[PDB]
Design a protein around this nucleic acid. Structure first.
Ligand SMILES: Nc1ccn([C@H]2C[C@H](O)[C@@H](COP(=O)(O)OP(=O)(O)OP(=O)(O)O)O2)c(=O)n1
Ligand SMILES: [Ca+2]
Ligand SMILES: [Ca+2]
Ligand SMILES: [Ca+2]
Length: 341
DNA sequence: CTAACGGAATCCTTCCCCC
DNA sequence: GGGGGAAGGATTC
């Protein structure tokens, strides 16, 4: 195949720069405020001016303000970024009917029936970049290869506003030389257990027997890495459909009293049913983050659709099921609806 | 009422009822 | 032995 992958460069921060061009060239930090104390939260993303000094996603806001006290700390307007994302995704549909929208800033395009060789695909990536830069003024990164994995790897390399094509020969040397921690789907928990087995490259998974690797990362993760190592990975581009919608808020204080959690729980249901917008769900899940950021969830599925009033009375029973089966105090409480019609 | 941490999705793994 | 569902986990954005 020939897969064209698009990744929006610092999406949340760049959209804020488009709406306010005076922020250009200045370190911008898009923050997610929680509401406990002031400056409590994490960094959603930051532009490359702020990311030079280590201000990247995940770090707390207070820790980022000690590195860059004079930076622009804007609240996260996710809906504004979603509207911009939606308009850009419609621009990509003109180039391929087979499109796979991964996240809010990632989209896979199967251009196997639109270009001949990789050079023509490279020219198509330039045409796509110059089109998003024209209509929406957003710089993106294009990664082109033979499957979805290496297309994302090609974009991860020439990340800041670039375009990279990994031909069939560079794929061969990457199976032998690329660090396996930089493979999509390989986080710290599994990458550490691969070094325990002595696997630092993709080709290492072909020497170790299957069950030795199967018992440490699982059957799916084992067959997935071996598929990439054998140069036999070719999962097709598929249209993704949202399978769940959730909203979870942070309470003012850690509490186990039911009547104190119900306002936050009912607040999540209102904001969750608003984000539903048609689509009647058949299951409701009450999600509670414990005192030490551990996740607990008690679900419930119905043979019919769930109404707003039903989600109200049923979430209380699911919430009580959490307090009866867990002694830790709750930090965040929320609701996730799945199994649509 | 301002305290060492956000919110939101996905697929996979384990455990267990069940044919 | 395997299908299929609830709850936890790892991943990534
Ligand atoms: N832990 C994270 C990581 C990312 N995001 C959001 C902010 C980003 O704008 C978007 C995509 O993040 P990327 O991982 O693609 O990183 P950026 O797009 O911010 O920059 P770059 O693509 O250069 O890494 O998702 C988030 O909320 N939380
Ligand atoms: Ca991305
Ligand atoms: Ca990006
Ligand atoms: Ca990684």
């Amino acid at each position: 195949m020939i897969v064209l992958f698009v990744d929006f460069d610092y999406f949340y921060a760049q959209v804020e720069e488009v709406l306010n061009p005076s922020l250009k060239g200045k370190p911008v930090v898009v923050c997610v405020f929680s509401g406990r104390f002031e400056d409590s939260g994490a960094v959603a993303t930051a532009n490359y001016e702020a990311r030079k000094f280590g201000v990247k996603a995940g770090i707390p806001i207070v820790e980022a303000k000690k590195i860059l006290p004079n930076a622009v700390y804007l609240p996260m307007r996710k809906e504004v970024y979603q509207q911009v994302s939606s308009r850009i995704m419609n621009l990509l549909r003109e180039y391929s009917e087979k499109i796979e929208i991964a996240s809010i800033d990632e989209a896979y395009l199967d251009i196997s029936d639109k270009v001949r060789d990789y050079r023509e695909a490279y020219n198509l990536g330039l045409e796509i970049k110059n089109k998003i830069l024209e209509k929406e003024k957003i710089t993106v990164t294009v990664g082109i290869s033979k499957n979805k994995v290496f297309a994302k790897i090609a974009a991860d390399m020439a990340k800041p506003n670039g375009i990279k094509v990994i031909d069939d020969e560079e794929v061969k040397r990457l199976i032998r030389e690329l660090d396996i921690a930089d493979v999509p789907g390989i986080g710290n928990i599994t990458a550490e257990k691969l070094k325990k087995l002595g696997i630092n490259k993709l080709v290492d998974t072909l020497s170790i027997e299957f069950d030795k690797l199967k018992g440490m990362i699982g059957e799916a993760k084992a067959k997935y890495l071996i598929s990439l190592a054998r140069d036999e990975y070719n999962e097709p581009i598929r249209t993704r459909v949202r399978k769940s919608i959730g909203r979870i808020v942070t309470m003012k204080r850690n509490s186990r009293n039911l009547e104190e959690i119900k306002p936050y729980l009912f607040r999540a249901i209102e904001e969750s049913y608003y984000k539903l917008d048609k689509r009647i769900p058949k299951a409701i899940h009450v999600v509670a983050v414990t005192e030490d950021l551990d996740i607990v969830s008690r679900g419930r599925t119905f043979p019919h659709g769930i109404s707003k009033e039903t989600a109200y009375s049923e979430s209380v029973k699911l919430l009580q099921k959490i307090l009866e089966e867990d002694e830790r105090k709750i930090r965040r409480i929320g609701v996730r609806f799945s199994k649509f019609i």
